[PDB]
Write a protein that binds this DNA or RNA. Structure first.
Lengths: 122, 122
RNA sequence: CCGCCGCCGCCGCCGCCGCG
RNA sequence: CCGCCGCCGCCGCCGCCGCG
């Protein structure tokens, strides 16, 4: 059991939920997808998000610089490894990537990117 | 001559400039690299940037939503095409990508990303 | 970390596929 | 646009290469 960078569990919808949602509403998805990759290993989350302030606060807590550092440092060696954060919401994907020496900075840009994309004007 | 999305010309350093700069100083590069891709076509810029407010203002002008739309629309067909903005500065790369229907939104996230990365704390 | 070359592994986008 | 499958083309990151 690899140690995840995430602090909240996955919330991917079932096929039937997604169909039901589709019938009743995408610029109004159930939520967004995000991932963190360290070398060859990728951890992924689908998280529900409804464009409210409470919901934004909840999903911004899915990972921290500390949680990312803990998970990522399991994979660090003599060489630097590639680290990548990606997020997709409403047709737009943002990826923030670089080497493990730069991880703190990557996390700073990743969290700013997530915040901006989740708040992008309707 | 394809029409560029950029409003400022490329400023890539020569091999000798870069060596000279290296001898006299990277978290202090000569500048940053950015690119816009529409389907198979990629336009690139190296731009000098010295972490001042005047310099930030100058390089934020290298493209606009209008200039991107003009260049990109040359390539639009019945299907949507993939559009991608990338920027690299001080070891961190950000890419903002999606389909041509979402281009306006891509440009909004791209310009916010560029601003944040170019201002990321020393 | 200026440009280019190819080689490795991973990732993202677009379009398509055919399953659940 | 939930998950998965492969197919297309482009892109980004890490490491390596060998030129300028």
């Amino acid at each position: 059991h690899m140690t995840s960078p995430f602090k909240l569990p996955d919330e991917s919808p079932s096929w039937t939920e997604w169909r039901l949602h589709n019938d009743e509403t995408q610029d109004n998805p159930l939520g967004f997808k995000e991932s963190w990759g360290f070398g060859k290993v990728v951890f992924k989350r689908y998280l529900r998000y409804d464009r409210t302030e409470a919901s934004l606060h909840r999903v911004l807590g899915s990972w921290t610089g500390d949680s990312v550092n803990y998970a990522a440092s399991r994979f660090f060696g003599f060489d630097q490894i590639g680290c990548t954060y990606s997020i997709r919401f409403r047709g737009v994907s943002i990826t923030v990537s670089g080497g493990s020496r730069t991880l703190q900075h990557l996390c700073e840009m990743a969290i700013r990117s997530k915040q901006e994309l989740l708040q992008l004007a309707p």
